């Protein structure tokens, strides 16, 4: 198999285009057939400040970041971003994150964002 | 249209102490999930309903093994809604072999590949 590197993901916070009462969200991280998830946090600018480690042994494909609106009976996708593994930075240094725009006639477009750090060590 | 999904049970290849699994159902940007059940032949017998306005898409089914820090996917299938029949109640279900990963067409799932030895028993019908 491949030699193991640790993928360290810092789920910092998000910024949603909408009202406080409309978002109670969690973040799911999916990579290499596994997933880990934050707690749900209420608001337009939720803060999680949670770090995750994944043991990675191949550099193909990506890290999928999903932001979900929690519900009682079903959860609803807020949006998602995909981050190819190969160009995640190789460093032991925690970063502040980068702002990533989530992928979802006369209405204004809606753009939701997540602040996310990732680095290999 | 009202899609009804009966998540019946599964049969895994492996020792029973290795599994504490749940089923996630995704359709039209929503998701619902069963409870976790232990063993190599877990029974959930849980029925779900989804309001559909895109009959051209599919239902993604994922089986996950619950862990403390991370969860591991046991496998997945994608059922095109065009294959689901009309009925007024749940049938005994069909066995589907779980595949290891989705095929992505332009960032959207369009199928699955690489069969496992694991299977799930599912009923789906429209009402």
Numbering used by the authors:
A (entry chain A): -2 to 101, 112 to 128
B (entry chain C): 2 to 128
Sentences from the paper on this structure:
The Munc13–1/α-RIM interaction is particularly interesting in this regard since its physiological importance has been demonstrated and both Munc13–1 and α-RIMs are involved in priming and plasticity. Our results suggest that a Munc13–1 homodimer–Munc13–1/α-RIM heterodimer switch regulates neurotransmitter release and some forms of presynaptic plasticity, and reveal the structural basis for homo- and heterodimerization. 2A domain can in fact establish two different types of interactions that lead to either homodimerization with itself or heterodimerization with the RIM2α ZF domain. Since the Munc13–1/α-RIM interaction competes with Munc13–1 homodimerization, this model predicts that Munc13–1 may exist in solution as a homodimer that needs to be disrupted in order to bind to α-RIMs at the active zone.
2A-domain homodimer at 1.44 Å resolution, designed a mutation that disrupts homodimerization, and solved the X-ray crystal structure at 1.78 Å resolution of a Munc13–1 fragment bearing this mutation bound to the RIM2α ZF domain. 2A domain of Munc13–1 encompasses approximately residues 3–130. 2A domain is sufficient and primarily responsible for homodimerization. 2A-domain crystals contains four monomers (referred to as monomers A–D). In contrast, homodimerization involves one side of the β-sandwich. This side contains the concave β-sheet, which interacts with the concave β-sheet of the other monomer in an antiparallel fashion. The interaction involves strand–strand hydrogen bonds through the “naked” edges of the β-sheets, leading to the formation of a β-barrel–like structure. The physiological role of Munc13–1 homodimerization is currently unclear, but it is plausible that it may play an inhibitory role by hindering α-RIM binding or it may help to stabilize Munc13–1 in the cytoplasm, before engaging in interactions at the active zone.
